[PDB]
Amino acid sequence: ETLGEKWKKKLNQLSRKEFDLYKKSGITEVDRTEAKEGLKRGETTHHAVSRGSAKLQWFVERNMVIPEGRVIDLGCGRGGWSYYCAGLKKVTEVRGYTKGGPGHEEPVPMSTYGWNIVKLMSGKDVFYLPPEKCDTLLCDIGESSPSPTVEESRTIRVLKMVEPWLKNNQFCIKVLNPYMPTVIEHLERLQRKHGGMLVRNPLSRNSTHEMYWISNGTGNIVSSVNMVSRLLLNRFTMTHRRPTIEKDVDLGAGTR
Ligand SMILES: Nc1ncnc2c1ncn2[C@@H]1O[C@H](C[C@@H](N)CC[C@H](N)C(=O)O)[C@@H](O)[C@H]1O
Numbered sequence: 536e537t538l539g540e541k542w543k544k545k546l547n548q549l550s551r552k553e554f555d556l557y558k559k560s561g562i563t564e565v566d567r568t569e570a571k572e573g574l575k576r577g578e579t580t581h582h583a584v585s586r587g588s589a590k591l592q593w594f595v596e597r598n599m600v601i602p603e604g605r606v607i608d609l610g611c612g613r614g615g616w617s618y619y620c621a622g623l624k625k626v627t628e629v630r631g632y633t634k635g636g637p638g639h640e641e642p643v644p645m646s647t648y649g650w651n652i653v654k655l656m657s658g659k660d661v662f663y664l665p666p667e668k669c670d671t672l673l674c675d676i677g678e679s680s681p682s683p684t685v686e687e688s689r690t691i692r693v694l695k696m697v698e699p700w701l702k703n704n705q706f707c708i709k710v711l712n713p714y715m716p717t718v719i720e721h722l723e724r725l726q727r728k729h730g731g732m733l734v735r736n737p738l739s740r741n742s743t744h745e746m747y748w749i750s751n752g753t754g755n756i757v758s759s760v761n762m763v764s765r766l767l768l769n770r771f772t773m774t775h776r777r778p779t780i781e782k783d784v785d786l787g788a789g790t791r
Contacts, residue, residue, distance in 0.1 A: 538764035539714025539744055543683045545771055546742065558742035561776040565589040565738070565783040579646035580788040587615025587675065588784050590738045591707065595623070599734060599749040600707040602626050604670030607700065609661045612640040614653070616673050618786055621649030626671070631655040632664060647786035662692065666699040677711025679743055686712035694721050701729050708748045713760050722748065722756050732756075735763045737779075741770050 549557060570582040583589065594600050603625035608617045611631030621629050626649070635641045635657030642655035661676065674697050680686050690712045697708050706729075712718060713733060722733060725748070732752030739745050744763060 537714045537716070538761055538768060539712075540683060542714075542744065542764050542767050545768070547681050554742065556775040557771065558740045559775075559778045560741055560770050560773075562740060562778045563737040563781060564778045565781050567783055570783055574643075579644070581647065581785050582645075583615055583647075583784050583786055584613040584618060584643045584645060585615035585640075586738070587612065588619040588786065589781075590736055591616045591619055591673070592784055593736055593738055594707055594734070594747065594749055595619075599732075599747075599751055600671070600673075600705050601751065602671045602673075603705060604628070605630070605668070606671040606673065607667060607669040608632070608655075609672070609674035609697070609700075610634070610676035611642060611655055612675070613643045614645065614655050616675060617653050617655060618645055618647050618650070619784065620671070620673075621653045621791075622647065622786055623649075627652065629653040630667070630669075632659040632661055633657055634660055645786075646788060648789050649791045651790045662696055668702070669700065669704060671705040672697065672700045672708070673706070674708040677709045677745065679711065683712060683715060687715040687718060690715070690718050691721060694718070694725060698725065698729075704750070706731065706748070706750045710746050710748055712744060713746045713756075714744055714764055719757060719760065726756060733759050735759070735766075741767055 573582045602620045602623050605628045606620045606626055608631040611617050611633045617629045617631040620626050641657055676693050731750045732754045733746045733748050733756050735746050
């Protein structure tokens with residue numbers, strides 16, 4: 536039994552009250568007040584449609600992924616990763632696909648900087664999409680479940696699905712459950728072939744062990760996974776630490 540599995544078991548024991556306090560304890564979060572108010576008013580400029588724009592920006596501004604040319608955004612949701620990439624100098628085209636429909640977010644149309652180079656498509660299950668040529672491959676798919684074996688199956692499926700899209704390009708792929716031994720085996724094989732490294736984003740909630748496989752980096756996958764498991768385990772030991780608050784991103788306005 537891995538450290539991650541011990542973390543999961545403890546998470547599933549928490550009451551809703553304990554869970555809600557644990558999930559943001561000591562994390563970093565952007566202040567969404569202004570964006571939520573603007574989006575409720577139907578404002579289409581400046582606001583990021585979700586917390587996702589700030590989350591991908593954290594990797595981008597650390598050069599862990601450097602979006603360029605044709606960007607494919609798998610599981611785009613409302614479009615936060617897509618609208619963020621739309622304003623980056625090196626990006627020329629953004630194609631987002633998302634499931635939508637009941638239980639899934641629909642793309643939100645925006646007029647933030649570079650909106651005219653974005654195409655978001657709903658009603659698209661990426662597990663049936665044939666791969667397309669692209670310069671940047673992003674994937675943020677991985678639905679949490681109280682069952683780690685269900686999460687293991689979901690994580691492996693994402694990893695098998697993204698590989699044919701990987702052709703010496705920039706990438707940032709969510710790994711929902713990176714601690715299960717079978718997932719580790721796939722991550723190690725994929726890293727030997729495609730390089731990159733698994734990174735924990737400080738904007739992720741403690742209620743998920745998610746890590747991101749990013750193209751520009753090296754390191755030991757097992758060590759990075761066990762470091763996260765120990766961090767999350769130590770976060771149950773103390774009383775709620777209020778999250779570190781940062782400014783949300785301003786995605787501006789205008790065509791390009
Ligand atoms: N099989 C699937 N094919 C397509 N989209 C999917 C599938 N499974 C889940 N999704 C979507 O993937 C999205 C994942 C989100 N974490 C994306 C948030 C996005 N990165 C943002 O910044 O707004 C959700 O909107 C799901 O509805």
